Structure formats: C-alpha cells, structure tokens
Amino acid sequence: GRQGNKFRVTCGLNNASTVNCADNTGAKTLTIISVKGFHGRLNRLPRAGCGDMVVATCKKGKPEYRKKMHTAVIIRQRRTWRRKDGVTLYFEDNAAVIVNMKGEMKGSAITGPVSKESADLWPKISSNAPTIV
C-alpha cells in the first residue's frame, strides 16, 4: 500500500519499544514486535524508523484491541534524523497509527503533527494529518 521510495531515516525504535497511538481507535500504547521488510542479521533487534510499517501488540487500550497483534505505521519519532536537504529535526515523542496491509487507516483522526517521511509513503495518512512536518 506504500506509494514511493523511502529515503534513509535513522531508525530509533527497537523491539519491545512502546510507542503512543496517534489514532482514535481506543488503543493507547503499542509495543513494537517486528518490522515489515527488515533484512535481519545475527543478534540484531528489528529497527523501526519513520514511515516504516511495523507489527505491534496493544498492551493498553479498549478490550477489543487489547492483547492482539496489529499493524502500525510510525508517524513521529524522538530520534534525530537528517533530511536530504540538510535539515536535522526530531519530534517530542514516538507515535504510530494503526493501519492494515492495504494502507487503509483504521482510525479517522491524528493528534499532533506527522512527519513528512510517513505522509507521502502512505497517502491515506497525509489526508488525516493536522500538519505534516
């Protein structure tokens, strides 16, 4: 469901790295389990950047979402990453929105900004964003 070629973003989220939930689906935190498209290596934990589809389990939220494995996309991260035009930026906290494999966003709103790298990757997310940093 992604539309385009992601650039290099310094991944700052590991395995078992709790992120918030910018969605409005009644889920609070989703601890990352894996990362889709991760070419692994020995003794290396899966890394999630910005705009990287992950697979995360909800450990806090509504009962129909708790204790289940979902698929999310990281919209903002606290790890500084450098754009190609020489801009060095980082956000205030990590967050991720629940999507499906086709990219269809499960919620209907996003709280806070959205990183540009995760907006053009999934056109279904950029529409819901308040702003796109």
Partner: protein, 387 residues
Amino acid sequence: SHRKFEAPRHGSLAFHPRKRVHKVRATVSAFPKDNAAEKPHLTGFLGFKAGMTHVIREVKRTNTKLPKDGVLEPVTIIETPPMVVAGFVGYKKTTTGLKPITAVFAEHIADEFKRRYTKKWYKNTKNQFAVHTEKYNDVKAKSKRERQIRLIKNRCDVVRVIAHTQMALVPLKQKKAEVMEIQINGGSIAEKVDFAVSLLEKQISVNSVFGTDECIDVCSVTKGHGYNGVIKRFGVRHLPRKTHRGLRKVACVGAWHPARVSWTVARAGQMGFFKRTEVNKKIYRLGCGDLKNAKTEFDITEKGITPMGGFPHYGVVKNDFLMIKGTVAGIRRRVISLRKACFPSTTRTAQEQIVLKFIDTSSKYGHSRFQTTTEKKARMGPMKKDL
C-alpha cells in the same frame, strides 16, 4: 560441528596481510588502458589534501525525488600547485613485465628534486645532477641524448614523464619535492616522445590533466592508528561482561585438530598506515583561474576557499585546488596521487552536471556562524578593543 547460526565473516581477506607502508606517497600501481587513436595526454597528477567542507548542491538529475532546494554534500579540498616535468622514461614490454629502457633528463634541475637522492642534505656536498648539467651541451653528451630518444621511439611501448611538485608553494614544512611518473596515453610512440620532449622543464597545471565533472581514482595512504586490538581492527563481537581475562577479544582462535591458527582468524596487530585506492570520485569545482574562489552564481560574496582561521592543522589554500566528492583516504597534509579512471563510469550520476549553490567557508572549530571575517565584524559591531 557446525556453527549454530551463520554470520558474515568480519574483515576483508583481499587486504591480508595488513602491512603498513613506508613511503608516505602511494605509488599508483596501474594506469588507464592506452588508447592509440587520440592526442597524447597526461593521465595523472599529485596533490596535497587539505581538509573537508560541506556544500549545498543543486540537483541536475532527471526522475529523482531529491528536494529542489538543494542537497547537502561533503567535499574535499585537495590543493594542487603546478608540477614541473623533469625528464621522461620509456618502458618496454618483455617476458617479465615492463623493463625501463632509458631515461632522459632535463638540464636545469631544481633543488627540490636533488634532495630526493640524499638522506642528509645539510652535510651532503649537493653535487647531484652536476656532471649531467655541466656536460649537457657537449657534442659527445648531446649525441647520447639524441641516441636515447631514437632508442625509445624504436624499442619502447610506454612513455612516462618524471614530474615533481613544487614545495615552496605549499605550507608544508617539507622541502624536498615528491616525484611521480605520469604516463602519457595517446598516439603512436613517435608522437608520445615528441609530446614528452615538448614538456621538459615546463610547468603543468591540473586543468591540463583533468577536466570539469570528471571522475578520478584517488590513491593515497590512510591514517595511522598504531597497535590496535581485535574489536577495532576487525570488528568482532565484544564478549559478555562476566568474562574472565577480559572482554574485547576473539574467543576461539581455531578448532582443535588442524593444530595451527588459520591465517583467517581475527588477530591483534597494526591497523593504520595502509595504502588504499578508491574509485569514482566526482570532481565538483576546478579551482583554476576563474573558479579559484568559493563564490557561486547564487551566492556572490568574494571569499577564498580557506575557512575563517585556516584549514585546521594545514594552513591556507591559495593555489590551484580540486573539490572531490566525499572522503578520500588519508588525513590532512597527506600526498594524494590522483589518476584518470581506469574504468570510466556510465551511471546517470557520473554524467550529471555539478551546479553548486553554496560552499561553506565558516570556521571548522566549534559551532561557528559567520562565513567571512569581514562579515563577523559587521554583525557583532565594534568591540571594546579598537574603540
């Protein structure tokens, strides 16, 4: 048994053994394949690395997603003052490789070239190239020179010019010049020598060797790091904290029965002063004549390439220079042997025109803000000093 989980081996076997070099300059071990259907041309140079700085480059490529504003890229400033050709040498292909047939030398030899033949100049009688110079015009020693040329035109296949730098134009403390044999690639051997003889004693500038937007194969000697362990040298995994007799080492240096440590096992040693040749190093700006400054069409302030306070540990760049792309092997003041590429690149990046929107000349110490010292004084105003 078999290792439980397979991994990529650490370090490269194409560089073993890792023996540090002796001479600071890195001899170029191969020159581009000779093409016999073009005007003879030099295929190399020799410049002293000065440092690095960052530029904002306008993208001139097609079907790319890079921002239209600019892309921030690192460059390297290699100061190359003009070299002086001091002879030439003709090689011949035998059943044991090239065999230098003869070598013709110019008449007037600078004192920076004579020093290379001695190990203690202050006590040396400094009589190098004296008998050769004093008898240069004699008829007996003029027929010998004319004989050497006819030998090369008949029994030689490769002609190279023994060119040496000028050490009075660089801020280095060294005085003796660095000697390089730059091959001539072009027409038949009849016109190679006629080109080589025409170059004697005549300075050659970098723009007569390289061109704009040309990729080159820099050859140099890396940084010196001395004795280093196994973690730094090869990159093995550091052992757990509980380990007895230390952590940062390889644990098992071989299985039992071969009864010998393999040559492939990661061992301690001397990482450091090695020789490496990189390839496909794009040239951004050719600091010859008009482009010797750091101004551009977009930013038109007249500033030299030397940052505020000079290049650290190096000094001030005032002569001809290059703008390589990215990091070239070797610390500042190293002698870098540029060379025309042996395998020319055909990628769409290598054929792309380089348009520079900005070149950083701010200071390289601390988090400097201003670009030229004539604009720091304007923004900060008058100090207590000078007032």
